[PDB]
């Protein structure tokens, strides 16, 4: 056994002498239970949060099938085939297959999250006419079916699972087979598919990051500046009682009101014409302009100057007609920003905890030094496997932390 010396090796003391997987398993279990309860109680069990809950359920059901077996094998001081009567490595293949399957399903689920988020934000017509709640709920089963179909290659074909040191760490074979048609094929295909899905997810997230900025810039240039102009003119007119500034200040107010009458809130963008939610907007601005016209004609045609009943009636009009739409629009934008900020960190975590396995698989594919234990360097597979593992324990805790309002809004406002 020149390469992969530890194979069918009884002594499991080669790799490490430590115990730190139990605390990780307990932390993940408690965090996933907390997140599951918090998400399923306040939400009565939004497609985005349904995707998040399905992904956390899959992660919880995944880590609890693979951590206790490693713990038991390390406790009994038996390798992955000596602890139980698994003839001809009936457990090493199961371990490797389940690990690869769960990683693939998680990456596909994150890709689906980013894709439907971008589609919902980008094209409201397609999102409202095609995507339903059932399709969003049923992402996990078809993804898992495709993942198991992809990973069931060695059963109906040729695919090599091997054990890296220590006694229990089983994964697909990468290096030093001296060339076969059915050995390096899966080793290249796995990392190629991983990189493709990661790049697709990053592309979708980058599109969704710009669509919302376009929406926010539209709203800020369309409503708030006109609102500020109305407020500033209404403040200016009171502080003076000359007969010249009243009329042109009022016509500046009229210009700002006519500009603001054409704007639109985001959700009402779905159906702009003949909208009662827009008809009330237009009616309120009609009343405001009519009051400005009454102030212009009756009061300041002659040089008589009362102007204060008109100013106070305009203040009542503003405070009673318009503020509802502005407040609800700002709330909607803040909600959407928080949702995409939640999704971005999950994408970053999944992407940046998958580079070592990819570049190791490509390192063993086209580069061939064909030596083992070169300056005691076989821990690359260990690091890749342990990072693919540690993706699970840090996924729901960041969601729990981000959903805590003790500091999630203080840093957002300050920074």
């Amino acid at each position, epitope marked *: 056994s020149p390469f992969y010396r530890c194979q069918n090796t009884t002594s499991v003391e080669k790799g490490n002498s430590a115990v730190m997987g139990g605390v990780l398993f307990s932390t993940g279990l408690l965090g996933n239970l907390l997140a599951l309860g918090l998400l399923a109680r306040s939400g009565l069990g939004s497609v985005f949060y349904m995707l998040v809950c399905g992904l956390t359920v899959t992660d919880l059901l995944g880590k609890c099938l693979l951590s206790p077996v490693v713990l038991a094998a390390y406790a009994q001081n038996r390798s992955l085939r000596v602890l139980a009567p698994a003839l001809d490595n009936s457990l090493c293949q199961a371990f490797a297959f389940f690990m690869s399957f769960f990683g693939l399903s998680s990456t596909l689920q994150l890709l689906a999250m980013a894709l439907e988020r971008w589609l919902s934000l980008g094209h409201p017509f397609f999102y409202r006419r095609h995507i339903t709640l059932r399709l969003g709920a049923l992402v996990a089963p078809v993804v898992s079916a495709f993942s198991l179909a992809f990973c069931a290659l060695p059963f109906m074909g040729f695919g090599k699972f091997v054990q890296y040191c220590p006694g229990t760490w089983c994964f697909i074979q990468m290096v030093h087979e001296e060339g076969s048609l059915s050995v390096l094929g899966y080793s290249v295909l796995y990392s190629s598919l991983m990189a493709l899905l990661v790049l697709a997810t990053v592309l979708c997230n980058l599109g969704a990051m710009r669509n919302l900025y376009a929406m926010h810039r539209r709203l800020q240039a369309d409503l708030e500046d006109n609102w500020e102009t109305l407020n500033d003119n209404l403040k200016v007119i009171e502080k003076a009682d000359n007969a010249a500034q009243v*009329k042109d200040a009022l*016509t500046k107010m*009229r*210009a700002a009101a*006519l*500009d603001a009458q054409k704007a639109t809130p985001p959700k009402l963008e779905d159906k702009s014409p003949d909208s009662p939610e827009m008809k009330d907007f237009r009616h309120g601005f*009609d009343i405001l*302009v*009519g009051q400005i*016209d009454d102030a*212009l*004609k*009756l009061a300041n*045609e002659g040089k008589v100057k009362e102007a204060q009943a008109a100013a106070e009636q305009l203040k009542t009009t503003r405070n009673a007609y318009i503020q509802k739409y502005l407040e609800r629009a700002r709330s909607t934008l803040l909600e959407e920003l928080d949702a995409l900020l939640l999704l971005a960190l999950m994408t970053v975590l999944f992407t940046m905890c998958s580079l070592p396995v990819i570049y190791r698989a490509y390192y063993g594919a086209f580069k061939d030094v064909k030596e083992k234990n070169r300056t005691s360097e076989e821990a690359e597979d260990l690091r890749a496997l342990r990072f693919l593992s540690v993706i699970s324990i840090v996924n729901p805790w960041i969601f729990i932390i981000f959903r805590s309002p003790v500091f999630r809004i203080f840093f957002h406002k300050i920074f």
Partner: antibody
Amino acid sequence: SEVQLVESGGGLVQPGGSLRLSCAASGFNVVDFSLHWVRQAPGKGLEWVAYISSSSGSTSYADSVKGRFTISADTSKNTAYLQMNSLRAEDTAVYYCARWGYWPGEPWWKAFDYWGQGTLVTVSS
Amino acid sequence: DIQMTQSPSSLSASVGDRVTITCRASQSVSSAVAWYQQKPGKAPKLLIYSASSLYSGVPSRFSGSRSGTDFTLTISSLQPEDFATYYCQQYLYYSLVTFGQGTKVEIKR
């Protein structure tokens, strides 16, 4: 009928004289539509003179003609009148009367959809 | 009482080409700008109101566009019966109405 604004009261008058331009509108009520006076010098641009609204009875004048021009209207005759009392040299022109609607809606956005043919006013010693 | 600066004063064009005239307001009059066509010796006529909309009966060769404070009148296929004078006017209040200087189009030779 058609929105026609037929004018009268035009001729040669001495400087310092007085004249009464009469604009009679057809097909619509003078109360429902604001009436404005627009004048044009011979071979020059356009110039707006005065504004009358019969529902509110509100009048307004340009800077040059205020205090010397008197705008009025009678709904019984459906007519607008402009009285000129101090005519200087720079008043020989062609005069016409245009209509306008009331806020809000479509009629306000269309400003001067109908005009008048105009009448000649000449002052010379 | 808001100015409407217009340019050029007079332009020479052929028949079939497209021409553009620009009117600039002194301040934001929103979307209330009108265009008028006048032959020598006749009353002016309205072509484009609300700074973009086409008046009823006006031929489709005339188009109006608004870019902030700038307004543009464009004639695509300059027919032989389009050699006249063109004015731009802003209207904000009943006492706030102001016309432009005008421009004249003549024949290339």
